[PDB]
Amino acid sequence: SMFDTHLVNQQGLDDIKLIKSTMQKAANEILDKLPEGREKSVFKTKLEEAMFFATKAAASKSGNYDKIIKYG
Amino acid sequence: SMFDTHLVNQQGLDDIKLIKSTMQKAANEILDKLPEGREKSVFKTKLEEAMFFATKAAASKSGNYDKIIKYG
Amino acid sequence: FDTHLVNQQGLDDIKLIKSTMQKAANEILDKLPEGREKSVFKTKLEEAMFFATKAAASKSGNYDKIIKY
Amino acid sequence: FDTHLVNQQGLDDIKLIKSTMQKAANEILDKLPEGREKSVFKTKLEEAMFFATKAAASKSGNYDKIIKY
Amino acid sequence: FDTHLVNQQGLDDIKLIKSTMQKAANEILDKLPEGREKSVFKTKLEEAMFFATKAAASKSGNYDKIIK
Amino acid sequence: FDTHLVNQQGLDDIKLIKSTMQKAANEILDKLPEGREKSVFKTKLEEAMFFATKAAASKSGNYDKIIKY
Ligand SMILES: Nc1ncnc2c1ncn2[C@@H]1O[C@@H]2COP(=O)(O)OP(=O)(O)OC[C@H]3O[C@@H](O[C@H]2[C@H]1O)[C@H](O)[C@@H]3O
Ligand SMILES: Nc1ncnc2c1ncn2[C@@H]1O[C@@H]2COP(=O)(O)OP(=O)(O)OC[C@H]3O[C@@H](O[C@H]2[C@H]1O)[C@H](O)[C@@H]3O
Numbered sequence A, B: 001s002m003f004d005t006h007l008v009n010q011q012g013l014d015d016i017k018l019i020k021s022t023m024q025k026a027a028n029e030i031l032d033k034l035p036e037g038r039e040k041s042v043f044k045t046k047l048e049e050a051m052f053f054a055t056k057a058a059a060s061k062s063g064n065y066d067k068i069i070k071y072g
Numbered sequence C, D, F: 001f002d003t004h005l006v007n008q009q010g011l012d013d014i015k016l017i018k019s020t021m022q023k024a025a026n027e028i029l030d031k032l033p034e035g036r037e038k039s040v041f042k043t044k045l046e047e048a049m050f051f052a053t054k055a056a057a058s059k060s061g062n063y064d065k066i067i068k069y
Numbered sequence E: 001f002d003t004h005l006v007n008q009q010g011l012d013d014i015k016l017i018k019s020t021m022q023k024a025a026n027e028i029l030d031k032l033p034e035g036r037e038k039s040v041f042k043t044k045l046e047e048a049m050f051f052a053t054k055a056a057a058s059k060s061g062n063y064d065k066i067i068k
Helices: A010-031 A038-059 B010-033 B038-059 C008-029 C036-057 D008-029 D036-057 E008-029 E036-057 F008-029 F036-057
Strands: A005-008 A065-069 B005-008 B065-069 C003-006 C063-067 D003-006 D063-067 E003-006 E063-067 F003-006 F063-067
Touching: A005 A010, A005 C008, A010 A038, A010 B010, A010 C003, A038 B038, A038 C036, B005 B010, B005 B038, B005 F008, B010 B038, B010 F003, B038 F036, C003 C008, C003 C036, C008 C036, C008 D008, C036 D036, D003 D008, D003 D036, D003 E008, D008 D036, D036 E036, E003 E008, E003 E036, E008 E036, E008 F008, E036 F036, F003 F008, F003 F036, F008 F036
Parallel strands: none
Antiparallel strands: A005 A065, B005 B065, C003 C063, D003 D063, E003 E063, F003 F063
């Protein structure tokens, strides 16, 4: 279910650290080249949405969480 | 207008090369950590959307294009 | 891209918000015919829930730790 | 871009699904702090409900007419 | 999630905006190769038209009833 | 994130698609009241056009060069 909560373990946190640190560094380097304005701001908001899905893919990877809390 | 076409010059192409190669390296490193599945696929599609805005920000940066083609 | 590690209060707020939407989603989905529009509804709803869950998890009082990168 | 002209059952289904989502949204919103994430939750939910409402409106038996262009 | 039950004037405006966009979309689609970008163009356009149609339906004079 | 450098045929296809949508969009916008829905229509339409323009620029026979990264 889209509503499930994955209780991530350290392996999940480690994977998330790798992906977020990697994207953070790349995003800072790209943002430094872009002029302030609407397109730069939309790039940032679209990138934040993308990262919810990358983070969820890591958090729910077999071995990266200990238990799932389900609702209903 | 959202419909304007910026004819990029070499400085725009150089900026776009920097931003796209930076994101391609980061995306490949992140994708290598993610399990095959829907979330990985949505990450990629959201990231493609984000990059249209980063690329447009670079292409229309003052000094990065020579002329704008306008319609209507 | 901060990560918020929720405390018990954050977990309980997330229980409330996710339980509330899951119940409403079940009732609505059971009324909708199968097909493209029902699928897209679920896609958009999941996107909404990422933002609601982040709002709850990053609310002051709801996290033990913020991890920055 | 079909235009659905719903009949009485279509209006009833849409009333149920929108009433159900409005109640759940209100309960969730009361738990969320003001800010960007809460605002995006609302906008995503509005997108979701366009598709749920289209699904209901074009359900067999729920329309007087579907106008095509 | 307000509902607008349009009157004839709202239905006429909606016919004009949707007919206009459908004609333009068909002309553009006839130029585009099959594939992912063409498919996403269509779904993005459907999303856009939900908002255009709601703007027209809630225009003063275009609705007979608002249901809350 | 390949970059397509259009040739003349790609530029002329882009002229056709962008001038067609700009005229339609102007006609529609002139019917719409100012407000949030009109604003989101424009934002969603811009997103649509990135994909249509990319589809045209990478169509076989419409590009001089593809830059890969
Ligand atoms: N062992 C844990 N101990 C403590 N806290 C944990 C653990 N494991 C996970 N968490 C966090 O709780 C929430 C989980 O709820 P969820 O339904 O599974 O995640 P989500 O839907 O993708 O929401 C997206 C947002 O939630 C925020 O906190 C998430 C998790 O980071 C994120 O920062 C996202 O920004
Ligand atoms: N005088 C009317 N008589 C009968 N039916 C009417 C009238 N006037 C409007 N309608 C229809 O009611 C439904 C709910 O309206 P709503 O709640 O305002 O719509 P929405 O949130 O914008 O989603 C919109 C999606 O629903 C479909 O049917 C819509 C309206 O076309 C749309 O085709 C979209 O696919």
